[PDB]
Design a protein around this motif. Structure first.
Motif, mmCIF file in Angstrom:
data_model
loop_
_atom_site.group_PDB
_atom_site.id
_atom_site.type_symbol
_atom_site.label_atom_id
_atom_site.label_comp_id
_atom_site.label_asym_id
_atom_site.label_seq_id
_atom_site.Cartn_x
_atom_site.Cartn_y
_atom_site.Cartn_z
ATOM 1 N N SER B 112 0.946 -1.104 0.000
ATOM 2 C CA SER B 112 0.000 0.000 0.000
ATOM 3 C C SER B 112 0.992 1.159 0.000
ATOM 4 N N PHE B 114 1.895 5.314 0.336
ATOM 5 C CA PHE B 114 1.471 6.616 0.844
ATOM 6 C C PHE B 114 2.606 7.624 0.701
ATOM 7 N N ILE B 115 2.262 8.895 0.501
ATOM 8 C CA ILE B 115 3.275 9.934 0.370
ATOM 9 C C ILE B 115 2.986 11.064 1.360
ATOM 10 N N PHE B 116 4.046 11.606 1.954
ATOM 11 C CA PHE B 116 3.915 12.675 2.939
ATOM 12 C C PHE B 116 4.749 13.887 2.539
ATOM 13 N N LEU B 133 5.920 5.895 1.781
ATOM 14 C CA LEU B 133 5.787 4.683 2.574
ATOM 15 C C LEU B 133 5.178 3.537 1.776
ATOM 16 N N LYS B 205 2.197 7.582 -6.344
ATOM 17 C CA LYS B 205 1.484 8.388 -5.371
ATOM 18 C C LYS B 205 2.154 9.750 -5.479
#
Lengths: 219, 211
Positions: B112, B114-116, B133, B205
């Motif tokens: 999965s 994710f980007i921050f 992530l 992402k």
């Protein structure tokens, strides 16, 4: 009964020299060789050298010949390893080992000594948020965390909500930046429905610098 | 004096019979030892003289070979056996093999992603760290490619991977792209493209600065 106890963790600047000890107990120290091995974080074991305590005769791995000196004090049942012209690449856990039963193997090992080499000095980290958003949401789950940046040396510990939150928590190995400082991240996945109600705080502890940080992470 | 261990990693399940190999570049008779090591702990002797089991070590462990080819076998793998194993020449020198990690086998699982974006806090200090992530995937091999305004970034990011998860046996990966505040504000599209054998095509992402 038999045991090897090494000195404490060390921090050094490049070009400096480090010397660590290993106290032997439970067997006749001078009667057997003492071996030294090292292991860089997450890497394999590497034999460095050995010494005959009785006559101080030594043998060193080819790559360390010239920078390493192994000595011993039969008066105090203690052996020593000295490494000079330290390089950042010398950052690793150093172990002493012995074979009191002559099995032709490293039967007993010390607990290891971490030697961290960097131009940086002991420093606490800055803790930044990794905020939950539509870009960190998967279905009914959301990811959030903390970026623990620019500290030295290892280690740093992270907990969430003082240990009350453990499910879905992932704290990653630190990476050593070209600046000579470490950085690591810690994340946790939670129900996106809990974002507006549940408080999430990452508790960061860097004992080397006595730095503790509690960082609240919000959407 | 060169010890080679392959595979570098092997996946198995409790109860399985596991066998790992080690080859010396020269003939070392039976001067060969095997060690076990777990994260944050010192190595532990398992076998010496190529096949002699160390006192106290479970009989499920065995070793064989002579000359240049050797092997370690674990009959009925127990949960406490997942760890890294090293062979070591005991003849002349004491060269260690590169090690072979025994990991928990499970089905392939895509990550999965994710980007921050960087926090306002950090930007104030003049630096911008973007984090990507990859959560709960398997196996361990994954690739992360950072792109800024479609330009592939190389040399300005670092990543690390966790140990297998205790409950689902997956891995997670965190990658950080770091740019000066000045460079960050000079671009708009920030993206991390992920490739993994569990994904039929790259998963991207991204976010636009000031989104």
């Amino acid at each position: 009964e038999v045991q090897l106890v090494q000195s404490g963790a060390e921090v050094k600047k490049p070009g400096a020299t480090v010397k660590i000890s290993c106290k032997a107990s439970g067997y006749t120290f001078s009667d057997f060789y003492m071996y030294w091995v090292r292991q860089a974080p997450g890497k394999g074991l590497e034999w460095m050298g050995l010494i005959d305590p009785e006559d101080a005769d030594t043998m060193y791995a080819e790559k360390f010949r010239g920078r390493v000196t192994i000595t011993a004090d039969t008066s105090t049942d203690t052996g020593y390893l000295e490494l000079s012209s330290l390089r950042s690449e010398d950052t690793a856990v150093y172990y002493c080992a012995a074979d009191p039963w002559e099995l032709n193997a490293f039967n007993v090992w010390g607990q290891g000594t971490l030697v961290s080499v960097s131009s940086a000095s002991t420093k606490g980290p800055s803790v930044f948020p990794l905020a939950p958003s539509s870009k960190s949401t998967s279905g009914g789950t959301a990811a959030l965390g903390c970026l623990v940046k620019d500290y030295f040396p290892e280690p740093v510990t992270v907990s969430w909500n003082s240990g009350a939150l453990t499910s879905g928590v992932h704290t990653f190995p630190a990476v050593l930046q070209s600046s000579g400082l470490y950085s690591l991240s810690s994340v946790v996945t939670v129900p996106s429905s809990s974002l507006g109600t549940q408080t999430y705080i990452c508790n960061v502890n860097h004992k080397p610098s006595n730095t503790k940080v509690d960082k609240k992470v919000e959407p | 004096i060169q010890m080679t261990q392959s595979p570098s990693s092997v996946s198995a399940s409790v109860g399985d019979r596991v066998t790992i190999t080690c080859r010396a570049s020269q003939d070392i008779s039976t001067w060969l030892a095997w060690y076990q090591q777990k994260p944050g702990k010192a190595p532990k002797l398992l076998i010496y003289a190529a096949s002699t089991l160390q006192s106290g070590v479970p009989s499920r462990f065995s070793g064989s070979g002579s000359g240049t080819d050797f092997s370690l076998t674990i009959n009925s793998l127990q949960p406490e056996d997942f760890a890294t194993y090293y062979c070591q020449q005991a003849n002349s020198f004491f060269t260690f093999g590169g090690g072979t990690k025994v990991e928990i086998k499970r089905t392939v699982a895509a990550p999965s992603v994710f980007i921050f974006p960087p926090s306002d806090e950090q930007l104030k200090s003049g630096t911008a760290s973007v984090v990507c992530l990859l959560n709960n995937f398997y196996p361990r091999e994954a690739k992360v490619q950072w792109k800024v305004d479609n330009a592939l970034q190389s040399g300005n990011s670092q990543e690390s991977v966790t140990e297998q998860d205790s409950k689902d046996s997956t891995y997670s990966l965190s990658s950080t792209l770091t740019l000066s505040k000045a460079d960050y504000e000079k671009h708009k599209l920030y993206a991390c493209e992920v490739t993994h054998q569990g994904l039929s095509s790259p998963v991207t992402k991204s976010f636009n600065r000031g989104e």
